Design a protein around this ligand. Structure first.
Ligand code: U0Q
Length: 255
């Protein structure tokens, strides 16, 4: 029925392989998991937006589960990022528009991703950004009540400072922060710091506003103004998405 033709990458749980149908030659992405999975499936079925991977279905063989997702012809945003360069500012702005739309949708249905980074942002045939990999995603709003998060997870260069330092924190500002690191990656082709901690010299340099160093040097003043509002240490002062949508660079016509 299915031939694991190429391994695509490791998810938080198990791996995802490019599977080819041996009857139609259908190229599709499948996540294999032998034995939280109840939760990742529940969440995938809630998901319906142009900037979130299309969810197909699931089947169990013993304690081995199968998740099928729309294969991304474009691959990952990571592969569109030239090390030490990034990408043309107009392409960065379009991907950031689509990433915001994806994130507005997810937060709208009380879901937080918790691992936004270029490896998990896929591109379709016409280069549309899709947020994939819901293995860390969880509900932060249900029956119109916010739940605070208390599980540390994600990728250290992407995680917000509050997640390293607070017992509990709001979900939405954590996703916004990781969108800021992604914007940094797209415009500079490098990550600013290993982790946003007081011990980390690059992160201290940023707090003390030294934007004459890298990667901020390589970033035009308009997008850097926006990164100034996103990468704010106190999550309560950090810009929200409604207010990102009012940002000058965000509304700047480009190309
Ligand atoms: C986003 C997750 C993290 C681990 C690897 N990964 C995925 C996919 C998923 N889900 C995924 C996918 N659906 N389609 C593709 N297509 C692809 C990959 N390379 N090229 C050239 C095209 N990749 C996926 N990856 C990496």
């Amino acid at each position: 029925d299915w031939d694991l033709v190429q391994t695509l990458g490791e998810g938080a749980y198990g791996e995802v392989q490019l599977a080819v149908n041996r009857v139609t030659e259908e190229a599709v992405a499948v996540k294999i998991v032998d034995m939280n999975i109840k939760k990742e499936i529940c969440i995938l079925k809630m998901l319906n937006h142009e900037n979130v991977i299309k969810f197909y279905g699931h089947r169990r063989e013993g304690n081995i589960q199968y998740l099928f997702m729309e294969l991304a012809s474009g691959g990952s945003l990571f592969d569109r990022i030239e090390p030490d360069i990034g990408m043309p500012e107009p392409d960065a702005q379009r991907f950031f528009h689509q990433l915001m739309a994806g994130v507005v949708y997810l937060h709208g249905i009380g879901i937080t991703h918790r691992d936004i980074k270029p490896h998990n942002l896929l591109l379709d045939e016409r280069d549309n950004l899709k947020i994939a990999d819901y293995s860390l995603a969880t509900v932060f709003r249900y029956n119109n009540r916010e739940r605070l998060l208390n599980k540390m997870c994600g990728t250290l260069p992407y995680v917000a400072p509050e997640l390293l330092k607070r017992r509990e924190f709001h979900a939405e500002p954590v996703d916004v922060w990781s969108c800021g690191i992604v914007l940094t990656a797209m415009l500079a082709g490098e990550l600013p710091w290993d982790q946003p901690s007081d011990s980390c010299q690059e992160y201290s340099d940023w707090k003390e506003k030294k934007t004459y160093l890298n990667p901020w040097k390589k970033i035009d003043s308009a997008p850097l103004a926006l990164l100034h509002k996103i990468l704010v240490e106190n999550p309560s002062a950090r810009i929200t998405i409604p207010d990102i949508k009012k940002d000058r660079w965000y509304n700047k016509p480009l190309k």
